[PDB]
Enzyme design. Structure first.
Site, PDB file in Angstrom:
ATOM      1  N   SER A 222      19.217  24.484   9.825  1.00 24.24           N
ATOM      2  CA  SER A 222      18.751  25.403  10.847  1.00 24.24           C
ATOM      3  C   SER A 222      18.535  24.686  12.159  1.00 24.24           C
ATOM      4  O   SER A 222      17.774  23.745  12.222  1.00 24.24           O
ATOM      5  CB  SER A 222      17.454  26.039  10.411  1.00 24.24           C
ATOM      6  OG  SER A 222      16.971  26.896  11.415  1.00 24.24           O
ATOM      7  N   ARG A 223      19.192  25.123  13.217  1.00 17.60           N
ATOM      8  CA  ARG A 223      19.095  24.388  14.461  1.00 17.60           C
ATOM      9  C   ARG A 223      17.686  24.420  14.979  1.00 17.60           C
ATOM     10  O   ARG A 223      17.155  23.405  15.425  1.00 17.60           O
ATOM     11  CB  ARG A 223      20.004  24.976  15.519  1.00 17.60           C
ATOM     12  CG  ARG A 223      19.882  24.286  16.856  1.00 17.60           C
ATOM     13  CD  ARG A 223      20.327  22.838  16.774  1.00 17.60           C
ATOM     14  NE  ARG A 223      20.207  22.178  18.067  1.00 17.60           N
ATOM     15  CZ  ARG A 223      19.097  21.605  18.511  1.00 17.60           C
ATOM     16  NH1 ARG A 223      18.007  21.643  17.778  1.00 17.60           N
ATOM     17  NH2 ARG A 223      19.076  21.008  19.693  1.00 17.60           N
ATOM     18  N   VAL A 224      17.062  25.589  14.907  1.00 25.77           N
ATOM     19  CA  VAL A 224      15.663  25.735  15.280  1.00 25.77           C
ATOM     20  C   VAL A 224      14.738  25.481  14.092  1.00 25.77           C
ATOM     21  O   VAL A 224      14.003  26.360  13.662  1.00 25.77           O
ATOM     22  CB  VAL A 224      15.428  27.136  15.872  1.00 25.77           C
ATOM     23  CG1 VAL A 224      16.436  27.393  16.983  1.00 25.77           C
ATOM     24  CG2 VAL A 224      15.605  28.199  14.808  1.00 25.77           C
TER      25      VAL A 224
END
Lengths: 61, 140, 122, 56, 260, 131
Positions: free
Chosen positions: B2-4
């Protein structure tokens, strides 16, 4: 030799008595545990019925 | 990925799941060459026995989503080695009891994680007492 | 074949049958090399149970009555489930393997087994 | 004097046996207590389950 | 080609398992000889009880020099079995340098031979051909070397390293002390753990769950007491002297059979 | 009715069929066994054994060890043994010649011990082959 047998008997009886005293206590813990479990089971049974009656009523809605 | 990844999580989750993310990383590599070394010292073996139990936590039944507190509580129990003693087929039946125990006996734990949103010291202790109480009950 | 769909009891048995069947398939290479005696006592069993299960899966059909002569058997879903419990629980370990072959119900295999014993005795 | 020697030796041997006797008695007490405690717990659990199942 | 390779390797694996089973049967065939020998070697010690008796094989001399015989596999493609042994061999040679008591290596098998040929900064007593299906013929030439070498005082505390077949997945090398045979007949490792020779465990390979495993299980062989009216033909010290080589020969054969 | 013989090598039980007489070498030099023999234990020297049962008596050279003889029973522990008929004589003789040649050369305190014990080994092989 004398000091040995007496110690064995002293220690030994301290230990048989102690073991059986522990048995009694447990007999107590279990006794306690059984009561708690019984009450919990009744409440849980109550849980099921109550909530399913709620589900019924929602179905009626 | 998950990038965030972690600006996403709540504070209780970021603390609790920091342990978790690492253990699975260990356990990808310890499952590797597990049958190659094959006489597992307890440095590798207990980290590998911890790992199987960790995988059990990730298991869930379909359409039974968990509350945030439950996830925080569940992740925490697994990471510390509390479930190490339990049989692999016993882990999923235990945790369900421990969650139900905690909603029913100890609702102060939910009030901490829902309000403070941080894995507080009061909260951590409050869980353990249920875990000790719950663990004792499960045995008999 | 999910537990929420077919029920818990049906799912457990199906999963067990696949596992028992799967182990037997793996063991075939080993059995040739070590023989049935050399296997451990669990794997003398899951080889035997697997053989019985394999035979139990085969069944006489209504359509094939012309060709083979033996009457077919329509077998319920409950009689199937109850049948593979008695093989996997080991309560039918004593029966021969050709009492499970081309029978419908679990009872038929037992009935077939008894008749075979009587015939053998004769 | 022979009787005195015997008395003292017996008194000591008897003390050891009693001390041995007491130790065994305490071990038995502990075992019984442990068994009893288990019954309570297990018993109640079983009760709720059976009761829980009936309620369900 | 990959599919063909998969079939070939699978066939090789099956053949290897069959060979291992055959090796197990081979160890079992020599059981009566080692069961009977340890029963005799026990009763020859319990009858003896004599300070004036000294046998050359068991004779203890100062450990100025040590002979290490290395029993490695004959061929390649077998994991790290050969690498592990030679690597473990090096530690023993290295350890002796700390003690500086002049190692010597008797190497058995081809991968051990080709190792110590290419490295000449070691002494070698002899190069022995490896052998599948090891026989008492082939352990005798090992024994005639080591026994002869040991009786002369040039080498002392001859020890052997080889892999006791403990598990399929791992088999660590272990180093034992061949000579000088203990008069109690106890067989012990260099580290200092000695098992009673009356009890030893054969390795039987069986399947645990789905997988193919091996379990080393030990059956103690009780030694019946010697006859009260038994008459010793030569001398008890002298009879015992004939007995020790049989035991040494029997041990070297098991060390090599197990390694194989 | 008779005593019974089991000769056994570290890998292989050779002779386990039972006989009326054997006669074996030893370190004392020679001994004979006949049935219901008293219990004796002899260290057996390398060199040939001769066993008679019934009609036929044959020598298998065997390479030394131990021989106890109990009630109604012999068991012989030998590190290597061959039947004298199964070895072909000429090849054994050739081996003996080779051993002798190496011995004649062989020198030094261990090495001769090896040469001497090898030629002693080789010489007894033909003596079962001829006999």
């Amino acid at each position: 030799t004398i000091r040995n047998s007496e110690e064995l008997r002293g220690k030994a009886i301290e230990q048989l008595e102690k073991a059986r005293a522990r048995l009694k206590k447990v007999e107590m813990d279990a006794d306690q545990f059984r009561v708690n479990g019984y009450s919990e089971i009744e409440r849980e049974k109550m849980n099921l019925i109550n909530s399913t009656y709620k589900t019924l009523e929602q179905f009626e809605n | 990925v998950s990038r965030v990844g972690s600006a996403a999580q709540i504070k209780a989750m970021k603390k609790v799941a920091g342990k978790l993310k690492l253990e699975l990383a260990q356990f990808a590599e310890l499952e590797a060459f597990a049958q190659f070394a094959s006489d597992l010292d307890k440095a590798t073996q207990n980290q590998l026995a911890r790992g199987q139990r960790l995988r059990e936590l990730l298991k869930q039944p379909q359409s039974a989503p968990l509350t945030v507190e439950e996830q925080v509580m569940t992740i925490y129990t697994g990471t510390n080695g509390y479930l190490d003693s339990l049989e692999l087929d016993q882990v999923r039946k235990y945790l369900v009891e421990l969650r139900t125990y905690v909603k029913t006996n100890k609702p102060e734990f939910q009030e901490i994680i829902s309000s403070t949103k941080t894995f507080t010291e009061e909260a951590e202790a409050l869980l353990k007492e249920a875990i000790q109480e719950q663990m004792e009950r499960f045995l008999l | 074949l999910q537990p929420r769909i077919v029920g818990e009891e049906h799912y457990e048995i199906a999963q067990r049958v696949k596992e028992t069947l799967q182990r037997y398939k793996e063991l075939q290479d080993i059995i040739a090399i070590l023989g049935l005696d050399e296997l451990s006592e669990e794997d003398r069993l899951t080889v035997a149970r697997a053989r019985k299960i394999e035979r139990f899966l085969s069944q006489p059909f209504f359509v094939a009555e012309v060709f083979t002569g033996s009457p077919g058997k329509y077998v319920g879903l409950a009689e199937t489930i109850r049948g593979f419990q008695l093989i996997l629980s080991g309560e039918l370990d004593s029966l021969p393997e050709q009492a499970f072959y081309l029978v419908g119900n679990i009872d038929e295999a037992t009935a077939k087994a008894m008749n075979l014993e009587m015939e053998s005795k004769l | 004097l022979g009787d005195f020697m015997d008395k003292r030796d017996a008194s000591i041997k008897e003390q050891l046996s009693g001390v041995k006797d007491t130790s065994s008695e305490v071990k038995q007490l502990e075992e019984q207590a442990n068994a009893v405690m288990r019954a309570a717990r297990a018993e109640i659990s079983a009760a709720l389950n059976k009761m829980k199942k009936e309620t369900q | 080609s990959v599919k063909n390779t998969q079939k070939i390797t699978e066939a090789m694996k099956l053949v290897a398992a069959a060979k291992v089973r055959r090796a197990q049967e081979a160890v079992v065939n020599g059981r009566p000889f080692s069961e009977t020998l340890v029963e005799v070697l026990y009763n020859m010690n319990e009858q003896l009880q004599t300070e004036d008796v000294d046998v050359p094989l068991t004779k203890i001399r100062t450990v100025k020099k040590v002979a290490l015989m290395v029993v490695t596999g004959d061929r390649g493609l077998c994991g790290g079995f050969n690498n592990m042994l030679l690597k473990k061999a090096e530690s023993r040679i290295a350890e002796l340098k700390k003690l500086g008591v002049d190692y010597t290596i008797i190497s058995i098998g081809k991968k051990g031979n080709t190792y110590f040929i290419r490295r000449p900064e070691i002494p070698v007593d002899r190069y022995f051909d490896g052998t599948n299906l090891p026989t008492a013929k082939e352990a005798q030439a090992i024994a005639d070397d080591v026994f002869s070498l040991f009786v002369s005082e040039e080498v002392d505390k001859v020890e052997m390293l080889y892999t006791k077949f403990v598990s399929l997945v791992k088999s660590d090398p272990v180093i034992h002390t061949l000579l000088p045979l203990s008069p109690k007949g106890e067989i012990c490792d260099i580290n200092g753990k000695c098992v009673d020779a009356a009890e030893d465990e054969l390795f039987r390979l069986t399947t645990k769950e789905g997988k193919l495993t091996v379990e080393r299980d030990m059956i103690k062989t009780e030694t019946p007491a010697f006859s009260p009216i038994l008459e010793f033909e030569q001398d008890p010290a002298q009879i015992l002297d004939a007995l020790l080589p049989l035991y040494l020969n029997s041990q070297i054969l098991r060390a090599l059979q197990e390694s194989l | 009715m008779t005593l019974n013989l089991c000769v056994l090598t570290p890998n292989r039980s050779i002779w386990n069929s039972e006989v009326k007489e054997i006669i074996l070498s030893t370190n004392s030099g020679q001994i004979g066994v006949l049935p219901n023999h008293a219990p004796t234990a002899t260290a057996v020297d390398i060199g040939i054994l001769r066993i008679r049962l019934n009609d036929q008596w044959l020598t298998l050279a065997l390479m030394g060890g131990f021989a106890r003889i109990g009630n109604n029973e012999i068991t012989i522990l030998v590190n290597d043994a061959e039947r004298g008929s199964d070895i072909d004589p000429q090849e054994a003789q050739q081996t003996l010649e080779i051993a002798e040649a190496n011995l004649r050369k062989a020198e030094g305190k261990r090495q001769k011990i090896e040469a001497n014990l090898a030629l002693r080994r080789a010489r007894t092989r033909v003596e079962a082959s001829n006999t």
